[PDB]
Amino acid sequence: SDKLKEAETRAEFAERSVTKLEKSIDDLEDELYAQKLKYKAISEELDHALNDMTSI
Amino acid sequence: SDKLKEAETRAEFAERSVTKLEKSIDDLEDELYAQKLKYKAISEELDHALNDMTSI
Amino acid sequence: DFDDIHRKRMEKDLNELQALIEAHFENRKKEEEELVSLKDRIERRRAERAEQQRIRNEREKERQNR
Amino acid sequence: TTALVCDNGSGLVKAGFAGDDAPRAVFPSIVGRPRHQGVMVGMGQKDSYVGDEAQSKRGILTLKYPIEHGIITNWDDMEKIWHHTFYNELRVAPEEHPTLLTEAPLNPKANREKMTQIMFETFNVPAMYVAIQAVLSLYASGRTTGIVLDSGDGVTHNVPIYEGYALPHAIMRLDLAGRDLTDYLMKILTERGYSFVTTAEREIVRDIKEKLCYVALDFENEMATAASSSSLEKSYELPDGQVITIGNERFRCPETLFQPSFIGMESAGIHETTYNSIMKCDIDIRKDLYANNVLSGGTTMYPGIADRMQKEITALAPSTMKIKIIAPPERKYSVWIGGSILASLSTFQQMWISKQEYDEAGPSIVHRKCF
Amino acid sequence: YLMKILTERGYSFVTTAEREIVRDIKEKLCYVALDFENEMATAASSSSLEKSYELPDGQVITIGNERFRCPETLFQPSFIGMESAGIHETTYNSIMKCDIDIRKDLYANNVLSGGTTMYPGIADRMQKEITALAPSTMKIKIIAPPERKYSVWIGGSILASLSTFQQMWISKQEYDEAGPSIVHRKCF
Ligand SMILES: Nc1ncnc2c1ncn2[C@@H]1O[C@H](COP(=O)(O)OP(=O)(O)O)[C@@H](O)[C@H]1O
Ligand SMILES: [Mg+2]
């Protein structure tokens, strides 16, 4: 019984850790992807600016 | 016996998974920071350009 | 006619340029340096988390190894 | 009170209160019913998404424009678009605001009469007035003469005006516009392997056309250069990945404007219908029209068109006249800015078609003195 | 298939009652490998994978590389002779049949359900496979709730508890008027 209680508690703690880590990963992923899209957009508008310079 | 075997086994899987998750988290965060720093270097390139544009 | 072209053109010919330059300067100042500093801070915290994870993993592997 | 300067257009509805610089709400004019079945219950699924809402759910809709070439082909959808524009994008009830619609030249009468009948019966406005889309674009430039080429998305028309006196016998209306360029681009993209068929993917091809295409200064030299080097191939990322590379399709899509034989149309390009429109005018106002050629409308926003057109007209015109092409940076909203200016005038305040006048003469009042 | 590959070590289960024992073995021991060839190489050199299990009468058995070979059939249906592609590629094919503008949302909201998706380590193998197949820009996310087994029934309870749904039932008088073929009609 003692071993069972300790094991179950350790398991539950680790499980909740797992869930929270997943949520953190998701949020950081969303922010990083938004930054990535921002970077692609800035580079593309930069190139458009370069081509505008080429025009004039 | 069945219960505690199950619990310890799934807990070990949890520990290995969560450690893999932590490696994933660190790699993602560091890559995010590197990309963000590249972006800020680009922003300061643009800010030097804006200081030139202070010509207007 | 053709006398409002001055009052609708010359205005933004300077005010718009100056205001957009101001906006770019303030946005760059607010954004880039703070983002790089915050990313460095988060990196340091991440390294500390890595050290804590290594210590805990090693001590648990030491005890549990049977 | 303030007047509502609506501008139906064909492709983008632009509206806003009179007296401002830019339209308050600009959104595509598409009404798309859902086409699949739908299994989630209580999701709150409507029967028709209009305006900018149907450009976000376009994956499961069948978008269909209610205005084909200037004329309106589906009156129920157009009524829905107007209702949306008044109530949700401006949030002003029409019972307390005059309206100033715009209409292309040489359009069928029944279209205009039905438009005024709707505005007076359904929305019940106090007074509405219909104006030709080119005179407004001439207002916005601050001129009083000049020949304006208003190449919209539905129809391209070329109205010459001198000293405020329009020349009704010299209006050259051509039905090539942005939509035909979108279809031709969608048709020549198939030469590399990319097939766009669905009415939703027409929007993607339109975005490609807007962001990448440009008008070549000299067509043959560009065709020769794009066939040897690879400095032109610009890539573009679809809404799901799988980037595509556009080669000499870049300047071949908008070249259709100057050679309408590409899409099988017989008529001459926009570079030669302007010269023909000038030559129909009297011999003493041709210099002023040459010097004050005005561009407007969305489709004239291609990078490098104000030079190609000037080169072509200079080739056609006599060598002594000076050819100047006015291309303001606010080209897209030029018609609406002109509409705002016209609605803000005090001299114009008595030209509205008051409701009691409509009650006495019926919808045919629009063709009468109140034009 | 597990009952068929267990015979390679000497354990023969034939009776329809022993299929239940093989099912219990599959539930308690099998797991989906993240990379198949590396696991096949590791299990053939070391012995860190061999997990033992006690039959309903004693005589413990030791499962070697049968652990991750049984559920691998999902991603390579050629093992049991089926022609079709695995569950990692029929999802991508099902996405590609959809319209071009809703593929990003489907990529980001891939949902797993049903009992058989409870193998330890499947939500990572499937994500790796789809990320290999899909374009590099899209984000691939696999929703694997812990209550996977009863997901269908929980959803059924939610649907039956809705007020908007209360008039969609096939009332008995309607069946009496149109016969059993009423189900294909508007009341789906
Ligand atoms: N920046 C741009 N570059 C090239 N083409 C454009 C651009 N913006 C709009 N267009 C084209 O012009 C059309 C919009 O024209 P618009 O002036 O709104 O028509 P309308 O006269 O009906 O308002 C779009 O369909 C698009 O094809
Ligand atoms: Mg227009």
Coordinates of N, CA, C and O and ligand atoms in Angstrom, one line a residue, chain D residues 7 9 14 133 150 152-153 297-298 335, ligand 2:
Chain D
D7 N -20.0 53.8 -53.6 CA -19.4 53.6 -54.9 C -19.4 52.1 -55.2 O -18.4 51.4 -54.9
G9 N -18.9 50.0 -57.8 CA -17.8 49.4 -58.4 C -18.1 48.0 -58.8 O -19.2 47.5 -58.8
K14 N -16.5 50.6 -52.2 CA -15.9 51.6 -51.4 C -16.9 52.6 -51.0 O -17.7 53.2 -51.8
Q133 N -18.6 57.7 -63.5 CA -17.4 57.4 -62.7 C -16.2 58.1 -63.1 O -15.2 58.1 -62.4
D150 N -10.3 55.4 -67.0 CA -10.7 54.8 -65.7 C -10.8 53.3 -65.8 O -11.9 52.7 -65.9
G152 N -11.2 50.2 -64.4 CA -11.6 49.5 -63.2 C -11.3 48.1 -63.3 O -10.4 47.6 -63.9
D153 N -12.2 47.3 -62.5 CA -12.1 45.9 -62.6 C -13.2 45.3 -63.4 O -13.0 44.1 -63.9
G297 N -8.7 54.4 -61.5 CA -9.1 53.0 -61.4 C -8.0 52.1 -60.9 O -6.8 52.4 -60.9
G298 N -8.4 50.9 -60.4 CA -7.5 50.0 -59.8 C -6.5 49.5 -60.7 O -5.3 49.5 -60.5
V335 N -11.8 57.8 -57.7 CA -13.2 58.0 -57.9 C -13.9 58.4 -56.6 O -14.8 59.3 -56.6
Ligands
MG2 MG -14.2 52.3 -60.5

